[PDB]
Amino acid sequence: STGSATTTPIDSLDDAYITPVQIGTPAQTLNLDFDTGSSDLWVFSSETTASEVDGQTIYTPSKSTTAKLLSGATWSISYGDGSSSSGDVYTDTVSVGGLTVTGQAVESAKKVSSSFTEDSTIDGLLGLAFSTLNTVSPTQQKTFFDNAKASLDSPVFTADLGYHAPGTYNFGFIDTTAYTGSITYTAVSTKQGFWEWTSTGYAVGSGTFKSTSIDGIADTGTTLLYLPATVVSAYWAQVSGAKSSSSVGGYVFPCSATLPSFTFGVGSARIVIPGDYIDFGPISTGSSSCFGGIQSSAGIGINIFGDVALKAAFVVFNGATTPTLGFASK
Numbered sequence: 001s002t003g004s005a006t007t008t009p010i011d012s013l014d015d016a017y018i019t020p021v022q023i024g025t026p027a028q029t030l031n032l033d034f035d036t037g038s039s040d041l042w043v044f045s046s047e048t049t050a051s052e053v054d055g056q057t058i059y060t061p062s063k064s065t066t067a068k069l070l071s072g073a074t075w076s077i078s079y080g081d082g083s084s085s086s087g088d089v090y091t092d093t094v095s096v097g098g099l100t101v102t103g104q105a106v107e108s109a110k111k112v113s114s115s116f117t118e119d120s121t122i123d124g125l126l127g128l129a130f131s132t133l134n135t136v137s138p139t140q141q142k143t144f145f146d147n148a149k150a151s152l153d154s155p156v157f158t159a160d161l162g163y164h165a166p167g168t169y170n171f172g173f174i175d176t177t178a179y180t181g182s183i184t185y186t187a188v189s190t191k192q193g194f195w196e197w198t199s200t201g202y203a204v205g206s207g208t209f210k211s212t213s214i215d216g217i218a219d220t221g222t223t224l225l226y227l228p229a230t231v232v233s234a235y236w237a238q239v240s241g242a243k244s245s246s247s248v249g250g251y252v253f254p255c256s257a258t259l260p261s262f263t264f265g266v267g268s269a270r271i272v273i274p275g276d277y278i279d280f281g282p283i284s285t286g287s288s289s290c291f292g293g294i295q296s297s298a299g300i301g302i303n304i305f306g307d308v309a310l311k312a313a314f315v316v317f318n319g320a321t322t323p324t325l326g327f328a329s330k
Contacts, residue, residue, distance in 0.1 A: 001099055001100075001148070001151045001152055001153065001172060002098070002099060002152065002153055002170070002171060002172035002173045003095075003096045003097040003098045003099025003148075003170070003171040003172065004097045004098065004168060004169070004170045004171070005019045005020060005021075005096050005097030005168070005169050006019070006020075006097075006166050006167070006168055007019040007034065007159075007161060007162075007166065007167045007168065007169050008166045008167075009162065009164065009165075009166075010119070010121040010122065011121070012164070012281075013280055013281050014161075014163065014164060014223070014307060014311070015223050016033050016119075016121075016122060016221075016223060016307070017033065017034065017161055017167065017220070017307070018031035018032065018033060018121060018122060018123075019031065019032060019033075019034050019096070019097075019126070019169055020032075021094060021095070021096055021126060022093075022094070022095040022096075023043065023059055023064070023092055023093070023094050023106055024059065024061070024063070024064030024065075024066060024067055024092050024093060025064055025065045025066040025092075025093060026064075027095070028057075028059055028060065028063070028064065029057070030043055030044070030057050030058075030059060030123035030124055031057065031121065031122065031123050032122070032123060032124050032125060032126040033122050033124070033125045033126070033221060034125075034126045034128055034159075034169055034220055034221075035125050035126065035127050035128060035129070035219070035220055035221030036128040036129055036159070036194075036195055036217075036218055036219055036220045036221065036317060037080075037127075037129055037194060037217060037219035037220070037221040037222060037304075038077065038079065038125060038127040038129055038133060038221060039127040039128075039129045039130060039131055039132070039133035039134040039135075039143050039193065040075060040077050040107050040125065040127045040133075040134055040135055040136070041094070041104065041105065041106060041107060041124070041125070041126050041127055041143065041144055042075065042077070042085055042087070042106075042107035042108070042109055042124050042125055043058075043059040043106060043107070043108060043109065043123060043124035044056040044057065044058045044059065044109055044112065044116075044123050044124055045058050045059045045060065045061065045087070045108040045109055045110075046058055046059070046060040046061070046062065046108075047061075047087060047088070047108050047109065047110050048087075048108075048109045048110060048111070048112060049110065049111055049112075052111065052112050052116075052117045053117065054117050054118070054120055055120030056120055056122070056123045056124075057123045058123075059106065059108060059123075059124075061090045061092065061106075061108060064090075064092055066092050066093045066102070067090045067091070067092040067106075068090060068091050068092070069088070069089075069090055070088075070089040070090060070091055070105065070136075070139075070141075072138065073088065073089035073105075073136050073137065073138070073139060073141075074086070074087070074088055074089065074136070074137055075087060075088075075089060075107045075135045075136045075137070076135055077135045079221075080222070080300065080304075081115070081222075082113075082115070083112075083113045083115040083116055084112075084113040085109045085111060085112040085113065085116060086109065086110060086111050087107060087108045087109040087110035087111065088107075088108055088110065089105055089106070089107050089108065089136055089141070090105075090106045090108055091103045091104065091105055091106065092104060092106045094106065094144060096126075096144065096169070096171065097169070097171075099148055099152075099171050099172065101144055101147040101148050103147070104144055104147055105134075105136060105141035105142070107136065107141075109124070125221065126144060127143050127144075128143060128144070128145050128157065128220070128317065129143070129193055129194055129195065130143075130146075130190050130193045130194070130195075131143050131146045132190070132193045133193035133194075145157055145171070145317075145319065146319075148171060148172075149319055152171060152172030152173075153172045153173055154172055154173060154174070155172075155318070155319040155320055156171075156172065156173070156174065156316055156317060156318050156319060156320075157169065157170065157171045157172070157317050157319070158170045158174060158175070158178075158314065158315060158316050158317065159220055159310060159314075159315045159317065160175075160178050160179075160314050160315075160330070161220070161307060161310055161311035162311065163274075163276070163277055163311055163312075167311070174316060178314050178330065179313075179314035179328035179329065179330045180328065180329050180330060181269075181328055181329055182269075182328060183314070183316055183326040183327065183328040184266045184267045184268070184269035184326065184327055184328070185267075185316070185318065185324045185325065185326045186198070186266050186267055186324065186325050186326075186327070187324060188322075188323045188324050188325050190323060192217075192302075194217040194218075194219070194302075195217055195218040195219075195317060195323070195325055196215065196216070196217050196302075197215075197216070197217075197218065197325050198213050198214065198215050198216075199213070199214040199215075199216065199264050199265050199266065199305070200212075200213065200214075200265030200266065200267060200268070201213075201214070201264075201265045202214070202227075202231055202234075202262065202263060202264050202265065203262075203263040203270075204234055204235050204238050204260055204261075204262060204263075205238055205260030205261055205262075205275075206260075207238075209263065209265070209270070210234075211265070212231075214227065214228065214231070214264075214303055215302075215303060216297075216302060216303030216304055216305050217302060217303070217304055217305065218305050218310060218315060218317070218325055219304050219305065219306050219310075220306075220307065220310060221306075222304045222306030222307065223280075223293075223306055223307050223308070224280070224293050224294065224295050224304075224306050224307070224308050225262070225273070225278075225293060225294045225295070225304070225305060225306055225308040225309045226295050226296065226297035226300055226303055226304040226306065227294060227295075227296070227297055227303050228296070228297060228298070228303065229296045229297075229298045232251065232294055232295060232296045235260070235262055235294050236251045236253065236292065236294070238260050239253045239257050239259060239260070240254070240257065241253060241254045241257065242254075242257070242292070244296075245283075248283050248289075248291070250291070250292060250295040250296065251292040251294070251295060251296075252283055252289045252290060252291055252292060253289070253290055253292055254288065254289065254290070255281075255282060255287075255288050255289065255290040256288070257290075258275065259275030259276065259278045259279055260275050261273055261274050261275050262275075262278065262294060264305070264309060266327040269327065269328075269329075270329075271309070271312050271313045271327055271329060272312065272329070273308060273309060273312040274312070277293060277308055277311065277312060278292060278293035278294055278308060279292075279293065280292065280293050293308045294308065312329075312330075313327045313328060313329065313330060314327070314328045314329075314330045315327055316328075
């Protein structure tokens with residue numbers, strides 16, 4: 001089997017991407033944030049505290065003839081961005097773009113933190129990291145990809161995110177028309193539950209490529225590119241007027257700047273992020289100071305190749321017996 005669905009930026013800045021997911025019988029379509037950095041499929045629901053729902057589409061398990069309460073199971077997740085959610089658990093039928101899993105754990109929110117309520121475009125998250133990170137207790141549950149793997153033509157899914165434009169998540173096949181050149185595969189450590197790999201270095205604009213190992217995660221659920229402070233300082237030093245702002249919480253730069261590109265290594269291959277992908281717009285409405293898309297990972301504990309990086313590439317999440325990650329230019 002295979003599946004294919006279109007993923008669309010939630011706003012004009014590409015702050016996140018949503019992909020429609022069919023849940024239950026008859027189908028309830030929710031637009032979920034496909035997150036290779038977490039392992040829970042959780043949704044706004046008829047159980048969510050009413051004051052915490054503000055425009056999202058909800059899953060109503062009582063209207064699904066295939067939904068079954070998973071007795072005694074609860075979940076609670078806290079994300080690196082400070083957001084959180086929690087609730088109970090159903091099993092139900094879940095389909096993405098033609099690909100169907102029966103018995104998928106659907107984590108129904110009872111509580112969401114304010115940032116989720118404040119974002120009316122995200123109805124929940126579909127985790128695509130390793131099932132070892134799933135938060136359901138007392139019996140951990142499997143991701144959608146983990147449940148679908150055995151049935152897929154190949155045990156893979158691909159992320160092709162657009163810059164200011166729609167893109168595609170494919171399950172079970174590699175679309176050889178979606179990228180240029182070849183796909184370079186690189187090793188993955190699953191010990192932390194993430195798609196964790198080691199970039200071979202970086203360049204800023206037309207500058208000299210610096211060979212240096214950068215360990216980090218391929219995370220479709222994080223907007224920006226978080227890298228070591230030495231690398232981020234080298235990038236922003238090339239932008240006249242850029243500086244790190246403690247009040248804003250990272251590097252800002254004059255909105256009139258033209259940004260240089262940023263290149264990261266995958267083995268001997270190179271992925272080039274165009275400068276425009278690094279512009280996240282005014283820090284506040286009407287400001288002429290703009291927020292940078294490359295930020296220090298220093299307070300995080302891990303480097304994060306988020307959407308800024310991944311949308312420059314066609315990315316293969318290879319779930320073979322020994323998982324690997326593939327990157328191609330596009």
